[PDB]
């Protein structure tokens, strides 16, 4: 019913 | 100006339905890919030398890998799910349709509008295949979740004799044939 | 193997344009409008099946964005080498007189996601009817993209797809006719 979606991870700066 | 593009790729492989699934979380830059995550191994893993601080640092947090190792199923296994019955379960049967093709003209036989990909296309003469004289585009993907492919037959026509263009798709349970009587 | 799901996002400087879509086996089953910020199904009949909060995917650009500027400046800005396309124009059946038909401008192997396509009839910019896919994805990550254009078939036309992209010197035109 709900496609869910995979996060990015967040690369430090 | 110079571009810059950064792309992420988030797979589901899929074998035997959700029985074996594994998930692949890719980062690329300008087309280089530098690190991963593989759910086979449970850690990121830096693809090229690029990619071994971003590795580094996000294996350090467990609550990050532990979200990402659940993957497989939070993610792989709720999508297959959701979207199988009609993609998975998707199954569209070919029209096809024999015509001449420019003294003498070779039979065509398209085969369109179908999906999936999979399909076999065979040739027959009055009622044995003529197995090796046979040329195709090979399969056509249309963007669109259809395929077709044109199959002609190098066979030149003689007046009397009767040749069939044979289809096998996941569609149909016996092939689906069309006659072309020369 | 038998059926992969792929989740395609990307983001491109200085364009500052992104995009996001889900393939299965080659097939795009939705894309995100980023502009709108609204969800896109490939299909009419797919939007009665499932749900997706489009949201989610401008967060994950945002992200993608964040990671842009930070890797190319790791890289020494580099900038990402083009790649020009091979352009293919077919109908999607056989063509025959009274019956309307489609014409397909398949876009192929290029890098980076950017391209100018125009349907010209008989010289004349075709923009009636005319109806497009997002950048695809492809296993050695280049990209793929669909035009299409609804016609019936004439003895009378000609059709030229024509397709611009920085890996060409200049446009490419891909000719046919009935
Ligand atoms: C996986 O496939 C095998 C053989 O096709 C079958 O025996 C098994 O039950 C499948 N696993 C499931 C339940 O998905
Ligand atoms: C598309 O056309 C515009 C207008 O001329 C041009 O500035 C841009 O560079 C073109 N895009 C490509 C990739 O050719």
Redesign the pocket.
């Known amino acids: 019913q709900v496609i869910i979606l995979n996060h990015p991870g967040q690369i430090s700066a | 100006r110079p571009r810059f593009l950064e792309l992420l790729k988030s797979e589901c492989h899929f074998f035997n339905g959700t029985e074996r699934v594994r998930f692949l979380e890719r980062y690329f830059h300008n087309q280089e890919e530098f690190v991963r995550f593989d759910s086979d191994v449970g850690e990121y893993r830096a693809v090229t030398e690029l990619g071994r601080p971003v590795a580094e640092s996000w294996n350090s947090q467990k609550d990050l890998l532990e979200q990402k190792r659940g993957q497989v199923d939070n993610y792989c296994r709720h999508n297959y799910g959701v979207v199988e019955s009609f993609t998975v379960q998707r199954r569209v049967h070919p029209q096809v349709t024999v015509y001449p093709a420019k003294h003498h003209n070779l039979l065509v036989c398209s085969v369109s509008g179908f999906y999936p990909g999979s399909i076999e296309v065979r040739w027959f003469r009055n009622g044995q295949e003529e197995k090796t004289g046979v040329v195709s585009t090979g399969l056509i993907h249309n963007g669109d979740w259809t395929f077709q492919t044109l199959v002609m037959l190098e066979t030149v026509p003689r007046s009397g004799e009767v040749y069939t263009c044979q289809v096998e798709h996941p569609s149909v349970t016996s092939p689906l044939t069309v006659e072309w009587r020369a | 193997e038998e059926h992969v799901i792929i989740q395609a996002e990307f983001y491109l400087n200085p364009d500052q344009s992104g995009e996001f879509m889900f393939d299965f086996d080659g097939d795009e089953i939705f894309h995100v409008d980023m502009a709108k910020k609204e969800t896109v199904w490939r299909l009419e009949e797919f939007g009665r099946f499932a749900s997706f909060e489009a949201q989610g995917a401008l967060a994950n650009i945002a992200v993608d964005k964040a990671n842009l500027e930070i890797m190319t400046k790791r890289s020494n800005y580099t900038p990402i080498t083009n790649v020009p396309p091979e352009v293919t124009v077919l109908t999607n059946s056989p063509v025959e007189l009274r019956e309307p038909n489609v014409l397909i401008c398949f876009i192929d192997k290029f890098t980076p996601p ?3 396509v125009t349907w010209l009839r008989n010289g004349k910019p075709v923009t009636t009817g005319v109806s497009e896919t997002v950048f695809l994805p492809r296993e050695d990550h280049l990209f793929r993209k669909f035009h299409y254009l609804p016609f019936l078939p004439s003895t009378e036309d000609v059709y030229d797809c024509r397709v ?3 890996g ?1 010197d200049e446009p490419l035109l891909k000719h046919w006719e009935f």
């Open positions: 950017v391209v100018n611009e992209h920085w060409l």
